């Protein structure tokens, strides 16, 4: 059983932006970064345990890294997955 440690690694970081702020104040939902796989069930369990909050539903999407032109060279950013988590009437963070 590695479910506990798995839940401690799916979550990577919160997402800060205008869309994130308006979603939180209006829809009571938090947007955060997750691992590349990060199935919806794992994200739901991780938020319930680590943040000790009740959740309703999770929506995930994959963001493709942009292609950047650094110096004389061309590079690409890494793809990452962000999840929208909808909390219930009781919210903490």
């Amino acid at each position: 059983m590695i479910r506990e440690e798995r839940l401690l690694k799916v979550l990577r970081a919160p997402h800060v932006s205008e869309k994130a702020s308006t979603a939180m104040e209006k829809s009571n939902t938090i947007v955060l970064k997750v691992a590349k796989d990060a199935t919806k069930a794992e994200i739901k369990a991780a938020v319930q345990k680590l943040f000790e909050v009740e959740v309703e539903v999770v929506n995930t999407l994959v963001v493709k890294g942009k292609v950047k032109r650094h110096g004389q060279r061309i590079g690409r950013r890494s793809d990452w997955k962000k999840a929208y988590v909808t909390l219930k009437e009781g919210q903490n963070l």
Partner: peptide
């Protein structure tokens, strides 16, 4: 000890750094 290393000072530090 591994669980508390993963739980605290690994997850909490990561959230602190991102914020």
């Amino acid at each position: 000890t591994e669980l508390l290393n993963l739980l605290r000072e690994q997850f909490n530090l990561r959230m602190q750094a991102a914020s």
